Design a protein around this nucleic acid. Structure first.
Ligand code: NA
Ligand code: NA
Ligand code: NA
Ligand code: NA
Ligand code: NA
Length: 1043
RNA sequence: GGAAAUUAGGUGCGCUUGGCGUUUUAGUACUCUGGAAACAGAAUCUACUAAAACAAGGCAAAAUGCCGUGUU
DNA sequence: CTATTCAAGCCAAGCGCACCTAATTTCC
DNA sequence: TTGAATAG
């Protein structure tokens, strides 16, 4: 049957709506659900990847320095340097002699923390911030007479500490100390100039951004040329050709020639510049003046500036003409004709200056050119600035039409069209379905990319199961991500409180309880300063409250063409003004004789109302002062493109992808989009539940509303004009009044089919990806009690924070948990006194320090004890963990990491009893082209679960896999507790959190199921991308994961 | 709507670093014991400094060495 | 078992290219 | 949101 497809593309969801194109009856509707592909996910990976390289290279830097000391025999395996103080050694080495153990440790400490190199350039006024820029500037003034080690030693004696925010210095500052130290220590130890050069190098040398990682990395490159070429784009007309450097000579000549060919001169002779004219212009003002003006070109062609038009212009109004960058950059230092008049050479210099990133590399590459350049010239060209970026065309494209630009008057696009050169496009004829590879090409956000890919896959599945639809209407989220979404919600709620407080203010002042039914009119009243905007006459609030029917909410721009139902297109005016106005703009109405005031008097009031705090909306201003003609089709097109349809870049890209696919394969499918503001208006007037608490079905419900919107536009012949623009087809009946507009769209009783629908499907995206986060980062120390139990040791930092009552609750509930309670009890009593004194306050340590300005100090009979920055306390008993004690030699206690992230769990049926084996991410090992589950770890866990060889393997469960526990179907979150056989799940049509809120249930919003002897039945279900359920069957547990 | 250019702003991918943070051990301080002091012993709580480890781990061999939390 | 509790690495500096938005000129 | 321990 012929149907209409509606799509609600969201951050997390894709809702589809399938309704009959004639019967208007809902065929099917459901939601596809998935994780938000927000940028922070990949950012975490890249951040961790970078962190590993830093730690690796820092270590490798040290090992090389130790190797240097080994080869010069200042360090051995027997040589001990434990009790040596680097700060004491580095200071002593600047003046006196050092031991081979004392001098070596000084060099090692320098090599470890070598400081910054790039920030050091510019000073910054200390705005009391802890930024690197301000800190470097701060230390520089303190190092005006002292070396780094001297300053650190002073801080170590005076403040008792060195490490922290203040320990940020320039690399050159450390190097300046190192040289001085090496200069003093040179005579005492047998070293050469190779030793001092090598160490200083090692101390300061770091890879550049264009050098990248070493030889092995898949993120690396072999040279600067390969590096830049892979990054740069390709030509528009020659896809196989790499783009040209932005500031090549022929590139700017191409730019300049286009400027001259676009010029129009009003004179007796030709209006377009002749060849010889452009030649003279190029030679006399373009190759002579860096920034060509309109006067110079006018003086050259012997006309006035006023006769010249069609030139590019800046925001100021000043004419903009192409600057010959390379020409003037080289001319300013070399005026030789051998170089300047060599276009090919200037091209090559431009390429080298742009591709390579350092003066030294420029010099070498320019020298390899074997041109007529002097070495003094080359070393001078290598310091030129601004050579960055690419041209959108290749040199092949530029050189091809360069003669055409000289001798003709056609610009680049005219010539390319004449030469039958069409921009690169992707063919979709060999495609059996809508591709998903092209998505990342025209996308900007990772969130949108996933939502688009899923949306396409939904469409492909729909057209496979239901056939091709005639109409596809799509809506996209207004938010770019969930963080932006919450921000919108907060702003919404804030405005709601303000308006609600405003209403309560009125009902308490006037006593009129009518105010709660006049919110929109009251909101307009305050926004218009109590004045009818069409008559500029005062609107008494008391009269508005008593007689609201005398004041009408009018639409500024008629919705028949504007399709705007928002607050921005609404004004509170007197009923007379709204009647006389009719279907016109304020401009069209106030210009007529039907009005009481002039448009100019109106325009003045609006502009002053649009300025200042609490001003009118900016969109309201553009509406109230609309001076274009409504009946013009071009004007109507702009309103539809803004308020009715969605013309955002992402939307257009996807919409073009679909239209191009259907066009190429000759498939008669009409694709369109719709603004969310209009669908919200429909949902509002069609009387849907304002509180969206039904769960995921709202996405599918929205899609049905969107699909219904498409149906309305095909039914009415007055909407045929607007419907044609939505489908973007080339080219009449129309909506004439406000009343006609309401009759068409506001049809609550005609959409009862949607609300009665109770057959929604749901599809949750299953995550089977190996090698995600294996474990939490935090390292934990352990202790053993008298019972022989191993206990986890936790830290309690930030004791002096305002809203931190962790210590307060800890002492009140379990004082014995503190390690301070057992060891050093005198300090504990000192803390208890502070705790007992501020029991009313949230954080006793906060209120204490907020008054005395002093912190809690360790007990000392001389009142000189150290400050307490954090407190250790015993946590839970150690169980599931990762033992990494071996990384710490002679450690008295275990050192562990916690939270072993589960990959999946395999359910076994063992002698009428359901059991399962938990597969951890740590248990999945990567190989060259595939991931394998550790067979030793699997059998081990299979033994720790009392699984027998007789047991029957049921199924494996990953995240968002559908599991049916005792007749109840859930979706899998993951293994919550391996030892206790507890897995966490969630509901399918809704979140369990919201499910409890609707039921007003105060229980903790987590569903934990226990797989034990009481467990009766376990079945694995699954869905397609549409949400159609089906049961599965398997023979053995999957061990090989292809990735 | 599309082509090129100028300016301003924005997004992503990738690269290069900085100073922190967690943990162990050692030293010191703090606490306890003895002593006239020196110092020794105990404790490992609190702080400071150094060295080392920091997703499990896998390559690599004198290296500005390399991979391991993303997408599909 | 249910109901409850705890806690989970972080800031700052620079660079390359790709893409997008807005404004301006020409043409297709 | 989620590993996972813990009181009852
Ligand atoms: Na490329
Ligand atoms: Na550059
Ligand atoms: Na008038
Ligand atoms: Na950027
Ligand atoms: Na807890």
């Amino acid at each position: 049957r012929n149907y209409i497809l509606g799509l609600d593309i969201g951050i997390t969801s894709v809702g589809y709506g399938i309704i009959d194109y004639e019967t208007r009856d809902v065929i099917d509707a459901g939601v596809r659900l998935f994780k938000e592909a927000n940028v922070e996910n990949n950012e975490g990976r890249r951040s961790k990847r970078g962190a590993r390289r830093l730690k690796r290279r820092r270590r490798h830097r040290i090992q090389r320095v130790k190797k240097l000391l080994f080869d010069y025999n200042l360090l051995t395996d027997h040589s001990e340097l434990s009790g040596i103080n680097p700060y004491e050694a580095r200071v002593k080495g600047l003046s006196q002699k050092l031991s081979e153990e004392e001098f070596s440790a000084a060099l090692l400490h320098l090599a470890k923390r070598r400081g910054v190199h790039n920030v050091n350039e510019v000073e910054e006024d200390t705005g009391n911030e802890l930024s690197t820029k301000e800190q470097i500037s701060r230390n520089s003034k303190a190092l005006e007479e002292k070396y780094v080690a001297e300053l650190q030693l002073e801080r170590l004696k005076k403040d008792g500490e060195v490490r922290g925010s203040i320990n940020r210095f320039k690399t050159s500052d450390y190097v300046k100390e190192a040289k001085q130290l090496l200069k003093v220590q040179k005579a005492y130890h047998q070293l050469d100039q190779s030793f001092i050069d090598t160490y200083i190098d090692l101390l300061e040398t770091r890879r550049t951004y264009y050098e990248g990682p070493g030889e092995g990395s898949p993120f690396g490159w072999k040279d600067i040329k390969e590096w830049y070429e892979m990054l740069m784009g390709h030509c528009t007309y020659f896809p196989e050709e790499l783009r040209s450097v932005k500031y090549a000579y022929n590139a700017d000549l191409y730019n300049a020639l286009n400027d001259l060919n676009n010029l129009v001169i009003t004179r007796d002779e030709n209006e377009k510049l002749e060849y010889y004219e452009k030649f003279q212009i190029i030679e006399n003002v373009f190759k002579q003046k860096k920034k060509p003006t309109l006067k110079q070109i006018a003086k050259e062609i012997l006309v006035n500036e006023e006769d010249i038009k069609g030139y590019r212009v800046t925001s100021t109004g000043k004419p903009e003409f192409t600057n010959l960058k390379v020409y003037h950059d080289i001319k300013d230092i070399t005026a030789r004709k051998e170089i300047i008049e060599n276009a090919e050479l200037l091209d090559q210099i431009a390429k080298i200056l742009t591709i390579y990133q350092s003066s030294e590399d420029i010099q070498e590459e320019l020298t390899n050119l074997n041109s007529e350049l002097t070495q003094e010239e080359i070393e001078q060209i290598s310091n030129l600035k601004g050579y960055t970026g690419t041209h959108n065309l290749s040199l092949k494209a530029i050189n091809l039409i360069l003669d055409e630009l000289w001798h003709t008057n056609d610009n680049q696009i005219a010539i390319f069209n004449r030469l039958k050169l069409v921009p690169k496009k992707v063919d979709l004829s060999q495609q059996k379905e809508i591709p998903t590879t092209l998505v990342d090409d025209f996308i900007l956000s990772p969130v949108v990319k996933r939502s688009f890919i899923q949306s396409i896959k939904v469409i492909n599945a729909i057209i496979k199961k239901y056939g091709l639809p005639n109409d596809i209407i799509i809506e996209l989220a207004r938010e770019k991500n969930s963080k932006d979404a919450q921000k919108m919600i907060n702003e919404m709620q804030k405005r709601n409180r303000q308006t609600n407080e405003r209403i309560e203010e009125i009902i308490r002042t006037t006593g009129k309880e009518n105010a709660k039914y006049l919110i929109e009119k009251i909101k307009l009243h305050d926004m218009q300063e109590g004045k009818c905007l069409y008559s500029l006459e005062a609107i008494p609030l008391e009269d508005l409250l008593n007689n609201p029917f005398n004041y009408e909410v009018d639409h500024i721009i008629p919705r028949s063409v504007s399709f705007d139902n928002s607050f921005n297109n609404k004004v509170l005016v007197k009923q007379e003004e709204a009647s006389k106005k009719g279907n016109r703009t304020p401009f069209q109405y106030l210009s007529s004789s039907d009005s009481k005031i002039s448009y100019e008097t109106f325009k003045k009031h609006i502009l002053n109302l649009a300025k200042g705090k609490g001003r009118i909306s900016k969109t309201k201003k553009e509406y109230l002062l609309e001076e274009r003609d409504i009946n013009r089709f071009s004007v109507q097109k702009d309103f539809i493109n803004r308020n009715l349809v969605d013309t955002r870049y992402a939307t257009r890209g996807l919409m073009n992808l679909l239209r191009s696919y259907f066009r190429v394969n000759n498939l008669d499918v009409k694709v369109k989009s719709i603004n969310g503001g209009f669908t919200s208006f429909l949902r509002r007037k069609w009387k849907f539940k304002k509180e969206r608490n039904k769960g995921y079905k709202h996405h599918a419900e929205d899609a049905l509303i969107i699909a219904n919107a498409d149906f309305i536009f095909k039914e009415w012949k007055k909407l045929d004009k607007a419907k044609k623009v939505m489908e973007n087809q080339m080219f009449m009946p129309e909506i004439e009044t406000e009343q006609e507009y309401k009759e068409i769209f506001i049809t609550p009783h005609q959409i009862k089919h949607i609300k009665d629908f109770k057959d929604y499907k749901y599809s949750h995206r299953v995550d089977k990806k190996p090698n995600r986060e294996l474990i939490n980062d935090t390292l934990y120390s352990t202790r053993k009690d008298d019972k022989g139990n191993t206990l986890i040791v936790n830290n309690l930092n930030g004791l002096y924070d305002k809203d931190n009552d962790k210590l307060k609750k800890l002492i009140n509930k379990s004082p014995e948990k503190l390690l301070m309670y057992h060891h050093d009890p005198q300090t504990y009593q000192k803390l208890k006194l502070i705790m007992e004194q501020y029991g009313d306050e949230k954080n006793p340590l906060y209120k204490y320090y907020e008054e005395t300005g002093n912190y809690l100090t360790k007990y000392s009979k001389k009142d000189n004890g150290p400050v307490i920055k954090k407190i250790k306390y015993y946590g839970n008993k150690l169980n599931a963990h990762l033992d990494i004690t071996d990384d710490y030699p002679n450690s008295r206690n275990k050192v562990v990491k916690l939270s072993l992230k589960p990959y999946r769990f395999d359910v076994y049926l063992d002698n009428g009893v359901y059991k399962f084996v938990t597969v951890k991410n740590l248990d999945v090992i990567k190989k060259e082209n595939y991931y394998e589950v550790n067979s030793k770890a699997y059998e081990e866990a299979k033994k720790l679960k009392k699984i027998s060889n007789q047991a029957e393997f049921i199924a494996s469960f990953y995240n968002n896999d559908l599991i049916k526990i005792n007749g109840e179907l859930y979706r899998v979150i993951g293994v919550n507790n391996d030892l206790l056989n507890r897995i966490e799940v969630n509901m399918i049509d809704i979140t369990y959190r919201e499910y409890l809120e609707n039921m007003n249930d105060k229980r903790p919003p987590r569903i934990i199921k226990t797989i034990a002897s009481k467990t009766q039945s376990i079945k694995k279900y699954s869905t397609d991308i549409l949400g159609n359920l089906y049961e599965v069957k398997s023979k053995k547990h999957p061990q090989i994961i292809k990735k």
